[PDB]
Copies of this chain bind each other. A is one copy, B any other.
Amino acid sequence: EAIYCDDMPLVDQELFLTFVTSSRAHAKIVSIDLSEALSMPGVVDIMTAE
């Protein structure tokens, strides 16, 4: 019965956020392609540093 954070009920029309993390320990980011990911089911937005 103890309510932890994720135990809180679904509030109306709430969205979910997950992160794409780095797979390199020290590298240049030469390009990022979101075109496929943006067009997939459920996707509302994808944010970068820009």
Is A42 on the interface with B (CB-CB < 8 A)? Answer: no
**Nearest chain-B residue to A12 (Cβ)?**
B9
- Classify the interface of chain A: helix, strand, loop or mixed: loop
Q: How many copies does the complex hold?
A: 4
Give the contact-size bracket for chain A.
under 10
Is A11 on the interface with B (CB-CB < 8 A)? Answer: yes
Digitize A3-15: 1 where CB-to-B-CB distance is under 8 Å, 0 elsewhere.
0000001111100
- The residues of B that contact A10 with a CB separation of less than 8 Å are 12
A-B contact pairs, 6 of them (CB 8 A): A9-B11, A9-B12, A9-B13, A10-B12, A11-B11, A11-B12
A residues near B (Cβ < 8 Å) are 9-13
